[PDB]
């Protein structure tokens, strides 16, 4: 089965909780030993494809949410600085309390980011163990093993956190963390890759940066330090800018802002609210986390989109990392690849629709054939020439090695021998499946509707709270507005999702 988000919507899953709190990382799932030659090659490819997808869903595809990390860091730093200020502490103590909150929060962000990389290197190490141990296969049968010069590398190794060849990274907290490395053996010399160092930069590096996993003519690159280095550098820029900025903020506020002027002890931070929602059941977490990361959102305008490449229709709300790409308009086609920022879409996956054209017209004795893989959590509803409608779930379609999907529909049919005139796909799910996806492929807004008034509007309006700076959030009004804008955005999504 093909993933609905990945293929059907030409999108990516969104997990941004790692930038807000301690996040649950997807554990290593390396193929077992004792497998057949083909199955190991297949499972190594599947293990790398799933790892690339989960690393993209959380870290790699969301590099533009770090502006929200900067905003979140400032909220906690300023609150702690205001507490010490209201208590009549020395400027030193006010700044120390602020910096500790910056360092404590950014350690949780750095740790989540490096644990995601560590789990990938650890899983790679157990892949390379299973590959070497397999009697019929070597590393070159599953990996490209080429460098920039298109020459075969001496060896591809993975040193998990704790290993002698794993790097030691100092967190904002001042504590040390071991980070796993992707090793390229060059004899006596060796290349080590981690999110901090990235690639070496010469032709001795892996042809495509990270290991290239190949199986049955299809291949993929993952664990590419070139994709992790810009995220680390921007995260490191944020840590340095918030530290220097809060030192400036404290100097501008100390003496000027009097004790009792600002009262933010009773205030529940957007980060805290999203952490609380993560502990319970309710609205979809990625949008709760995206609101907490102060990403411009249009909660009030429901848009029905058509993913151009597949024809999949989906109703939902938009979120833009950079509202400069916006305002998105009704009837217009948008290419997210031309956008300066990233496009997010919160929708009920149970409402995914779309015309299915990847089918064979001839029904050979009840056996209906599909020329493309059906999507996960969906069912292909076929309309026969004798006006008979039958829906078959994705898991009930049987695959052949020649890229076709068959299912015996003779028990549900009266006229087994017929021709399929029409076909469409719809969700299998009975309950709501609200989720946030990142739009990668082109899409057209077929309609825009204001959810409160119920009217058909022509443009979108993105809302976010004022971002933090070294001179702002020095008044009660500013802090009360932050609290209120967050509360009304959460309530808006909580109302729409029930
Ligand atoms: C497939 O068919 C079974 C009956 O054999 C049905 O109960 C189930 O809902 C279907 N779902 C999948 C994904 O196989
Ligand atoms: Cl490789
Ligand atoms: Cl990756
Ligand atoms: Cl790099
Ligand atoms: Cl979600």
């Amino acid at each position: 089965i093909a993933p609905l988000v990945g293929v059907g919507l030409a999108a990516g899953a969104v997990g941004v909780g790692w930038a807000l709190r301690e996040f649950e990382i997807v554990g290593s799932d390396a193929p077992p030993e004792g497998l057949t030659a083909d199955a190991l090659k297949q499972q190594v490819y599947q293990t790398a494809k799933t790892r690339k997808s989960t690393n993209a869903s959380t870290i790699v595809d969301n590099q533009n949410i770090l502006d929200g990390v900067k905003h979140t860091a400032y909220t906690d730093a300023k609150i702690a600085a205001i507490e010490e200020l209201n208590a009549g502490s020395a400027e030193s103590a006010v700044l120390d309390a602020a910096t500790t909150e910056v360092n404590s929060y950014l350690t949780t962000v750095q740790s989540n980011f490096l644990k995601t990389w560590n789990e990938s290197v650890a899983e790679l190490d157990s892949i390379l163990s299973t590959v070497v141990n397999h009697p019929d296969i070597g590393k070159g049968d599953v990996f490209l093993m080429l460098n920039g010069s298109d020459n075969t590398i001496e060896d591809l190794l993975a040193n998990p956190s704790g290993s002698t060849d794993a790097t030691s990274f100092t967190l904002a907290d001042g504590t040390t963390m071991s980070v796993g490395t992707v090793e390229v053996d060059r004899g006596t010399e060796s290349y080590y890759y981690d999110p901090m160092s990235g690639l070496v930069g010469d032709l001795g590096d892996l042809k495509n940066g990270g290991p290239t996993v190949q199986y049955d003519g299809d291949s993929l690159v993952y664990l590419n330090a070139s994709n992790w280095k810009p995220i680390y550098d921007e995260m490191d820029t944020v840590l340095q800018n918030v530290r220097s900025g809060i030192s400036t903020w404290v100097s501008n506020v100390y003496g000027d802002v009097q004790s009792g002027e600002i009262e933010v002890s009773d205030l529940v931070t957007p980060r805290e609210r999203a952490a609380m929602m993560a502990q319970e059941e309710g609205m979809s977490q990625a949008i709760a986390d995206l609101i907490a990361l102060n990403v411009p959102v249009d909660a009030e305008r429901e848009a029905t989109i058509t993913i151009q490449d597949t024809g999949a229709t989906l109703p939902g709300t938009f979120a833009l990392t950079d509202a400069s790409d916006g305002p998105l308009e009704s009837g217009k086609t948008y290419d997210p690849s031309t956008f300066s920022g990233d496009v997010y879409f919160t929708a009920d996956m149970s409402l995914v629709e779309g015309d299915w054209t990847a089918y064979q017209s001839g029904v050979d004795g009840g056996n209906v054939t599909l020329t493309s893989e059906p999507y996960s959590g969906t069912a292909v509803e076929l309309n026969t020439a004798a006006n008979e409608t039958v829906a078959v779930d994705a898991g009930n379609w049987t695959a052949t090695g020649n890229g076709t999907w068959y299912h015996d529909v003779s028990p549900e049919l009266e006229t087994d021998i017929t021709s399929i005139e029409s076909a469409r796909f719809l969700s299998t799910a009975e309950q709501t499946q609200y989720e946030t996806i990142q739009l990668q492929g082109s899409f057209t807004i077929d309609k825009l509707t204001n959810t409160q008034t119920g009217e058909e509007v022509t443009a979108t309006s993105f809302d976010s709270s004022e971002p933090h700076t070294d001179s702002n959030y020095i008044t009660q009004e500013e802090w009360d507005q932050l609290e209120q804008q967050n509360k009304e955005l959460i309530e808006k999504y909580e109302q729409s999702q029930s």
Side-chain angles (χ1 to χ4, degrees):
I1 296 160
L4 175 66
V5 170
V7 182
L9 309 166
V14 178
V16 296
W18 61 272
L20 289 171
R21 68 199 163 268
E22 198 192 6
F23 215 47
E24 289 178 353
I25 286 158
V26 175
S28 162
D29 186 7
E33 285 189 36
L35 296 173
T36 62
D38 193 68
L40 180 62
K41 297 197 266 177
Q42 173 152 247
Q43 282 193 30
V44 163
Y45 182 81
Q46 278 150 357
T47 297
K49 191 187 195 132
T50 309
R51 186 55 64 187
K52 191 215 183 289
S53 195
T54 62
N55 288 351
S57 301
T58 58
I59 290 170
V60 185
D61 278 8
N62 320 305
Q63 329 88 338
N64 294 314
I65 60 155
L66 289 162
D67 256 324
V69 175
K70 188 189 107 174
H71 181 78
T72 303
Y74 265 124
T75 299
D76 289 348
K78 285 179 189 180
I79 286 160
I82 292 155
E83 298 269 26
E84 286 250 30
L85 177 68
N86 281 352
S89 313
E91 208 175 307
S92 57
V94 171
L95 181 48
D96 287 320
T99 57
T100 298
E101 289 298 288
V102 174
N103 297 332
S104 191
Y105 163 60
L106 294 169
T107 288
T108 306
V109 175
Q110 289 165 320
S111 301
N112 287 329
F113 175 83
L114 296 169
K115 275 177 199 292
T116 306
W117 176 267
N118 287 354
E119 212 56 35
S120 314
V121 178
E123 190 183 57
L124 178 63
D125 186 48
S126 54
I127 285 153
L128 303 164
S129 294
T130 309
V131 172
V132 166
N133 283 308
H134 199 285
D136 313 322
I137 291 165
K139 289 182 188 171
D141 300 299
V142 293
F143 296 103
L144 185 73
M145 304 289 278
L146 290 182
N147 56 37
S149 298
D150 298 312
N151 271 279
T152 304
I153 61 155
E154 287 223 335
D155 215 0
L156 168 69
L157 299 167
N159 313 282
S161 61
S163 295
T164 47
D165 292 286
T167 319
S168 193
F169 178 79
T170 314
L171 298 160
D173 218 339
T175 61
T176 50
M177 187 187 181
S178 189
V179 177
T181 64
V182 182
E183 187 177 337
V184 181
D185 192 280
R186 301 193 92 248
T188 46
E189 185 208 48
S190 296
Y191 289 171
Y192 302 92
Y193 308 144
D194 59 359
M196 303 80 88
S197 77
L199 301 192
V200 181
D202 70 297
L203 291 166
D205 295 2
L206 291 166
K207 200 199 167 185
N208 308 319
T212 295
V213 180
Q214 59 179 29
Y215 171 74
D216 200 34
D218 316 297
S219 179
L220 62 86
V221 190
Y222 93 121
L223 290 175
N224 186 3
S226 278
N227 291 345
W228 290 72
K229 178 63 169 164
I231 306 159
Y232 165 76
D233 284 347
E234 197 177 315
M235 201 185 288
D236 194 69
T237 299
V238 160
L239 175 64
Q240 295 301 316
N241 289 355
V242 180
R243 277 164 175 177
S244 308
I246 202 72
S247 189
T248 302
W249 188 87
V250 172
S251 291
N252 303 348
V253 161
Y254 200 80
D256 210 330
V257 172
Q258 302 279 114
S259 300
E261 209 169 318
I262 317 160
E263 288 296 335
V264 287
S265 314
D266 193 68
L267 160 63
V268 182
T269 75
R271 182 214 186 177
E272 189 185 353
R273 197 184 283 263
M276 290 168 75
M277 283 185 272
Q279 285 184 288
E280 58 179 45
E281 282 187 350
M283 63 173 271
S284 55
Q285 205 46 57
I287 186 58
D289 292 345
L290 280 174
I291 291 151
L293 283 154
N294 197 46
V295 172
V297 171
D298 189 338
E300 263 303 321
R301 274 141 288 236
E302 197 196 285
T304 59
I305 58 159
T306 293
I307 305 299
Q308 298 196 305
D309 282 20
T310 60
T313 51
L314 186 65
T317 48
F318 284 108
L320 292 188
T321 64
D322 195 349
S324 181
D325 305 349
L328 308 180
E329 302 158 354
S330 192
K332 298 292 180 186
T333 298
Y334 291 98
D335 190 9
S337 60
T338 64
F339 295 167
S340 303
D342 293 309
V343 184
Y344 297 98
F345 199 73
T346 309
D348 181 1
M349 297 299 134
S350 199
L351 295 169
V352 71
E353 266 191 286
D355 193 62
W356 191 267
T357 294
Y359 67 90
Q360 292 209 276
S361 295
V363 185
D364 203 299
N367 270 293
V368 178
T369 305
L370 301 183
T371 50
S372 293
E373 205 157 18
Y375 309 133
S376 59
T378 72
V380 183
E381 208 190 84
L382 301 163
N383 293 337
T384 61
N387 284 341
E388 301 172 338
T389 303
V390 180
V392 181
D393 308 329
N396 281 322
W397 285 98
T398 53
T400 45
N402 292 336
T404 44
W405 286 267
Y406 73 98
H407 178 74
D408 190 26
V409 187
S410 62
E412 291 170 300
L413 289 173
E414 277 53 55
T415 58
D416 58 348
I417 305 165
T418 183
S419 295
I420 305 291
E421 295 302 316
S422 305
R424 78 163 204 264
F425 74 91
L426 57 86
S427 192
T428 314
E430 288 148 74
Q431 280 185 22
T432 63
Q433 287 195 339
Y434 282 92
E435 300 171 18
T436 302
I437 60 160
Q438 183 181 307
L439 305 170
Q440 322 283 359
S442 289
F443 65 93
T444 314
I445 300 160
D446 290 348
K447 208 219 282 172
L448 291 172
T449 300
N450 189 291
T451 48
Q452 189 170 6
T453 59
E455 71 194 312
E456 199 175 295
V457 297
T458 57
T460 56
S461 176
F462 292 93
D463 287 324
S464 77
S465 296
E466 188 175 304
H468 285 269
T469 74
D470 38 22
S471 60
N472 61 13
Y473 287 89
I474 62 161
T475 78
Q476 189 72 67
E477 190 184 11
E478 283 178 272
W479 281 106
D480 291 349
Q481 209 191 9
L482 183 141
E483 183 186 75
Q484 197 48 236
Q485 279 157 356
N486 177 249
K487 195 207 169 193
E488 62 197 5
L489 273 174
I490 291 312
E491 282 175 334
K492 282 169 190 188
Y493 275 99
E494 283 209 67
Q495 279 156 36
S496 67
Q497 285 197 34
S498 57

